[PDB]
Enzyme design. Structure first.
Site, short mmCIF file in Angstrom:
data_model
loop_
_atom_site.label_atom_id
_atom_site.label_comp_id
_atom_site.label_asym_id
_atom_site.label_seq_id
_atom_site.Cartn_x
_atom_site.Cartn_y
_atom_site.Cartn_z
N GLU A 1 -4.30 1.97 -8.39
CA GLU A 1 -4.68 1.52 -7.06
C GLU A 1 -3.43 1.26 -6.23
O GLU A 1 -2.49 0.64 -6.71
CB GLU A 1 -5.55 0.26 -7.14
CG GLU A 1 -6.34 -0.04 -5.88
CD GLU A 1 -5.63 -1.01 -4.96
OE1 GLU A 1 -6.20 -1.34 -3.89
OE2 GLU A 1 -4.52 -1.46 -5.31
N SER A 2 -3.44 1.76 -4.99
CA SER A 2 -2.34 1.60 -4.03
C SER A 2 -1.11 2.23 -4.67
O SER A 2 -1.14 3.44 -4.96
CB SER A 2 -2.22 0.13 -3.64
OG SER A 2 -1.65 0.00 -2.34
N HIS B 1 -8.01 -4.24 1.69
CA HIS B 1 -7.39 -3.40 0.68
C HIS B 1 -7.16 -4.19 -0.60
O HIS B 1 -6.51 -5.24 -0.58
CB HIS B 1 -6.08 -2.84 1.22
CG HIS B 1 -5.22 -2.18 0.19
ND1 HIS B 1 -5.34 -0.85 -0.14
CD2 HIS B 1 -4.23 -2.67 -0.59
CE1 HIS B 1 -4.46 -0.54 -1.07
NE2 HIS B 1 -3.77 -1.63 -1.36
N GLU C 1 -8.90 -0.57 5.37
CA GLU C 1 -7.68 -0.48 4.57
C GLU C 1 -6.52 -1.23 5.21
O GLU C 1 -5.67 -1.76 4.49
CB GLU C 1 -7.30 0.99 4.37
CG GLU C 1 -8.14 1.73 3.35
CD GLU C 1 -7.78 1.39 1.92
OE1 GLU C 1 -8.58 1.68 1.01
OE2 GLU C 1 -6.68 0.83 1.71
#
Ligand SMILES: NC(=O)c1cc[n+](CCCn2ccnc2/C=N/O)cc1
Ligand SMILES: NC(=O)c1cc[n+](CCCn2ccnc2/C=N/O)cc1
Lengths: 540, 540
Positions: free
Chosen positions: B199-200, B444, B331
């Site tokens: 993630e990210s 996010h 986001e």
């Protein structure tokens, strides 16, 4: 149980604790409540005296630290974390502490009241460097120290309204002073020989009590260390205090969009917000990017301060008053790593001239372009106008003179020329245990550990010469507390400490070497700040 | 005594621990060393495999967190504290964790490998939201998560030299992937069915392993959540990486005053500085005031990344690969509170028109004045060009599209059009226990708790419907890890999840309501970022 650890005061009874020093025991009463907890509806309001309590209050450990911003610039660093809170943060923090010798003095003993500094946004009376067990044991005096509300909880002011009058942090200190008048005799202290002494924002607080009539009758001597009430950071205007308070409310959602437009509903909305929420937006209300400027400071409201501190100093009588003022060698070096471009504690901070010109606008905010040109003229070595080492020292002297040294010299000159007997010093010893870089020299705040006899603590790696230096400094502060004269009333073998006068301007240097008398507290540099720059701003 | 808590791997023996879930027990092996401690002379160097050990290594608790900056913007706030380290900080941090069901699967089970995010400057595999006891119990799979060096310790790059080659944090992840190939079978895992998901910055890391040949043969499926390797924040040039590394050395006093400035003596000076000293100057090397930008990120060095991720994606073949990409609805709202003017989590953030124009220069840095004008056009509703609520949502979409959504949409387009079977989603459920303000929507990072089945924890205050929704997402992710297709192979009653193609551009929404197929991952907005804006910058 010992008989000297149980004391009855006007509120009730207290059980103390017996601390241990390398040269004898000492009794302590840590955590005495002197006011009702200023929580809920009493937030931003003046303190109320503590109601009498039943039973015995435990006074064996320090109480909570008032809610305040915590420095996170250098995490894990000893130089910054030694000033951070060492107890839990709480609005229930109005507690004081009393140290008294063992055995308890049978004769009335002078009392020393300590007011901590920290830019009116932080600080606590429970820090290790404020331990009064060494000063009380060596000089057999009574030391008192209190907590006062800092930040928005202690200095948010909506002038005019009664829900947030301002200066309530100063009223916390005054209520603690009235407590000393009513109860220090139970610990063996003389309420007719009280010596206020503080550092930085505490020194400014001591000066503001000199200018407030109701607080003047609570003490008799004053010591101002690296601070003064006439400093450019110590006070704020009635209109600016309203703007800073209103924008803080806006950042936390007050008033609820968009009902409400008066101070009553604005303060009512602030009282519902959690304490940490107000702290997280404290630095976001400053008008400009600057060092040595703080959001919520004492306000000139016409009540506690009837006029500006500069006006009250000029038109005031100070006969029958002993004052001890002083500064450290490098007052400005500490504040440069908090915003000045090119400065870092982990390198030599060899700044360029471009960074020097930008640092002047940060170190001296709210000045015209012409006034900034006058500052860079007086502080530039025109033989070496590009030397980074000299530009670093120059900007350190700019911030030090503008914020500490010259406001102190201005105050010391007016006090001596209006009745008061003034003694001046300049602390020039860099501690061997100092964790800050060498280019900072003797930074702001690092004479306190020697005044409180911290080098006498065997668990610390001080040198033998610094221990003797600590005892000599404790003798000076104690002699000034008893007799109003830092010199030993019967000592002829040691050099004498001459008073400070507006003409001779004599001061002494505090070092490992014996006393050395000098003249002029940066007289040439401070004439620019105290005489010319005011006239340079009058004509825009 | 349980016999399934003692496992022998190629390095030695390990003692695990049996964790409790509301639906059954799970065996965990937390803190398995997969590399020698990168300390002393090994700082900034690629990882070395852990040499075999005698005795039994205790794998019953999480090991240390790699050294990293700690967020202090909102102290005590759940929304940000949940991402801070929950273990002691240490450079001795290269440890992985393994979750396996009880009883241990007698047949080879697909393995999920989690890579945490955090802008390549923070993160840890021991956070509560990354707990794999629920996904392993409910879907009977093997979950593996490792720590990797972040910040300067993992991504400081002096391209050319072997003392600081760069991308060593990515090499920490690769060594953990090679460890899974050699030892996951001892826990009942199938090394021929390894599914990477992050993630990210973890999603960008998963994407960079697709583009590196040596890392390609270590996994078979990929899931990229709210991140992509082609994002404007995921990589940096060799020249910029050298400038950022040199200034960090300057801020910590490297090289000393009068020493040569070659790479060998520079890295040698950095290896002597304490770890915390490098961290305190990490954010001081960014070129401009900006959000969603990080100091030390992966670098295009020609070794790990032979070319830029954008180039490697276009000139690559992805046949026989299943990828699952997706984003959350809002986001960009999370990153706004870190620097956009007028933004605060404690109010409505109703910014003005002037604050919106300034935030565009912060949310979209490094662009020209004309390029910023084009961004203002596409995201201004000219029927209400000064509505604060619409300007707030606009800047949130500006940062979200520029950094996450559009780099993801472009990656998903080139993957599907070059052999890969791609599924896409948009997470649109706001957790009932979310502590962030309501105007941020679905921020996010707050779909991870639902993928890991955290609502199944009884100590949490989630709702009943959210628990069923968490079991749905765990089923989707497990079905993708098992078959490469998130749809149920036995349930034709539930709505189907169609693949994402470059023409149809189909995706589904994930919320409490059943699946709903939509078309266009911000197709109109991302055509500005992916097609027009590159041409607007080519002509300056
Ligand atoms: N969070 C922030 O962006 C922030 C900005 C300024 N400060 C001010 C630091 C304190 N300071 C500034 C100048 N002098 C001082 C005193 N230090 O003891 C703190 C935090
Ligand atoms: N004033 C400082 O020392 C400072 C601290 C943290 N930052 C970065 C905070 C994190 N961040 C910035 C932009 N986007 C992010 C993402 N946070 O999750 C910048 C400056």
């Amino acid at each position: 149980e010992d008989a000297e650890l149980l004391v009855t005061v006007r509120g009730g009874r207290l059980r103390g604790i017996r601390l241990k020093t390398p040269g004898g025991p000492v009794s302590a009463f840590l955590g005495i409540p002197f006011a009702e907890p200023p929580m809920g509806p009493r937030r931003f309001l003046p303190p109320e005296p503590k109601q009498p309590w039943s039973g015995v209050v435990d006074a064996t450990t320090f109480q909570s630290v008032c809610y305040q911003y915590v420095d996170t610039l250098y995490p894990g660093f000893e130089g910054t974390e030694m000033w951070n809170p060492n107890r839990e943060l709480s609005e229930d923090c109005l507690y004081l502490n009393v140290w008294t010798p063992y055995p308890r003095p049978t004769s009335p003993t002078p009392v020393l009241v300590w007011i901590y500094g920290g830019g009116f946004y932080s600080g606590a009376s429970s820090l290790d460097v404020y331990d009064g067990r060494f000063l009380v044991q060596a000089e057999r005096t009574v030391l008192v120290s209190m907590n006062y509300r800092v930040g928005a909880f202690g200095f948010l002011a909506l002038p005019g309204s009664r829900e947030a009058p301002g200066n309530v942090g100063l009223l916390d200190q005054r209520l603690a002073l009235q407590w000393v008048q009513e109860n220090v005799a139970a610990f063996g202290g003389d309420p007719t020989s009280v010596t206020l002494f503080g550092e930085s924002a505490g020194a400014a607080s001591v000066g503001m009590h000199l200018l407030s009539p109701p607080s003047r009758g609570l003490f008799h001597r004053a010591v101002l260390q690296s601070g003064a009430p006439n400093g450019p950071w110590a006070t704020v205007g009635m209109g600016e205090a309203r703007r800073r308070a209103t924008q803080l409310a806006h950042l936390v959602g007050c008033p609820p969009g968009g009902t409400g437009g008066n101070d009553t509903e604005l303060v009512a909305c602030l009282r519902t917000r959690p304490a940490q929420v107000l702290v997280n937006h404290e630095w976001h209300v400053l008008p400009q990017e600057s060092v040595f400027r703080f959001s919520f400071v004492p306000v000139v409201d016409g009540d506690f301060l009837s006029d500006t501190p500069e006006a009250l100093i000029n038109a005031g009588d100070f006969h029958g008053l002993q004052v001890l003022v002083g500064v450290v060698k490098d007052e400005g070096s500490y504040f440069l790593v908090y915003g000045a471009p090119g400065f870092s504690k982990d390198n030599e901070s060899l700044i360029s001239r471009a960074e020097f010109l930008a640092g002047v606008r940060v170190g001296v905010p709210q000045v015209s372009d012409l006034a900034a040109e006058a500052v860079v003229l007086h502080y530039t070595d025109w033989l070496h106008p590009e030397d980074p080492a000299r530009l670093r020292e120059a900007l350190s002297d700019v911030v030090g003179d503008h914020n500490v040294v010259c406001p102190v010299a201005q105050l010391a000159g007016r006090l001596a020329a209006q009745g008061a007997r003034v003694y001046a010093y300049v602390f020039e010893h860099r501690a061997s245990t100092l964790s800050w870089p060498l280019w900072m020299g003797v930074p702001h705040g690092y004479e306190i550990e020697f005044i409180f006899g911290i080098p006498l603590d065997p668990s610390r790696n001080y040198t033998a010469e610094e221990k003797i230096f600590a005892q000599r400094l404790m003798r000076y502060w104690a002699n000034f507390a008893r007799t109003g004269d830092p010199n030993e009333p019967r000592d002829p073998k040691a050099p004498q400490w001459p008073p400070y006068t507006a003409g001779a301007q004599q001061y002494v240097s505090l070092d490992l070497r014996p006393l050395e008398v000098r003249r002029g507290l940066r007289a040439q540099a401070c004439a620019f700040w105290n005489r010319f720059l005011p006239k340079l701003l009058s004509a825009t």
